[PDB]
Amino acid sequence: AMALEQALQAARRGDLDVLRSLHAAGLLGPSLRDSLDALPVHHAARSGKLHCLRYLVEEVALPAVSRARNGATPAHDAAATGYLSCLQWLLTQGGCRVQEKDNSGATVLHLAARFGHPDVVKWLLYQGGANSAITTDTGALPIHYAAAKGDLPSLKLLVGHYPEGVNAQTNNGATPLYLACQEGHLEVTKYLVQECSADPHLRAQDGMTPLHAAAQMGHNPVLVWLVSFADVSFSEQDHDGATAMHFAASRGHTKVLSWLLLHGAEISQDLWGGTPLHDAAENGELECCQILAVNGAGLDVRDHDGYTAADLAEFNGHTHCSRYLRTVQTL
């Protein structure tokens, strides 16, 4: 266990002399792995220590294509961490193939996009030969990852390289735009809608629109822009009848909730009879309860189980919300 910690630490630090000493003592080998099955080659590559990576592959003979528990090679580590020098060496001298996949089906191009490394994305596309049309086992393209990260330079590169990806949906139905809205990336959202003809009406498999995702995750700047400039309705419902307001109230996003109410969004029941006040009360979101109650939410509306919002707060132990709601009802 001591040789292991010394080897991994030296590989991350670039301490080539320690690796040489361990190699001389016969203490480096392909079974010397951490708890995720990563070798010293992974730890050098994820740390940008190219001289140690080369020593471990060229001299110690640790395989450049070795795989961690999830199938990641040292090239996957390097692409995810942005260490282009290590990635380039592995893909040329090291013998890694640019299309090698981890267990999920992700390539180094997916991972460079996922973690927002546009220098790596650019080199992979225009020198490394990486394929931009490859889906993982969830249906994800590199463009999905770039959009979710909010990496506009990588996204521009990937749209130019594979423009058919713009409106592609993952297996659960998400478009790059859905993901950009979910993650609150306004400039990427604008680019997709304004410059790439991204369709903001393509829904995920559960009926959620990109606007629902922005409200669910509290990204008011994205929600405001979609409603105000992209012709997205804040009244649309998912497969359960939920509106943007339900999602915002359920997760305490008072700014989204306020903006929706300010601009005339209605306080409506979903297919289960719950209003956004039910969602806020059930989850102990006191400030959302107050905003809804002051702006005309029906305090006495019962869901399909016959429960008012105050009842739901009480059954979930949210006594601050139930006490507030029951006193307001008396007025």
């Binding site: 995720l36 994820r46 961690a68 528990r69 999830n70 990641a72 580590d77 995810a80 961490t81 981890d102 267990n103 999920s104 992700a106 991972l111 996922r114 973690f115 993982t136 969830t138 994800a140 999905h144 990852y145 979710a148 993952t170 659960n172 139905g173 998400a174 859905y178 993901l179 979910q182 995920a204 995702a213 669910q216 995750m217 359960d240 939920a242 339900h246 999602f247 359920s250 997760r251 969602d279 059930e282 989850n283």
Partner: peptide
């Protein structure tokens, strides 16, 4: 219910754990 709905993810949690522990 609604609050427990997770965002749409592109990879498995085990995958995210691994790539997050590279830094």
């Amino acid at each position: 219910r609604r609050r427990c709905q997770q965002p749409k993810m592109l990879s498995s949690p085990e995958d995210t754990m691994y790539y997050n522990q590279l830094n």
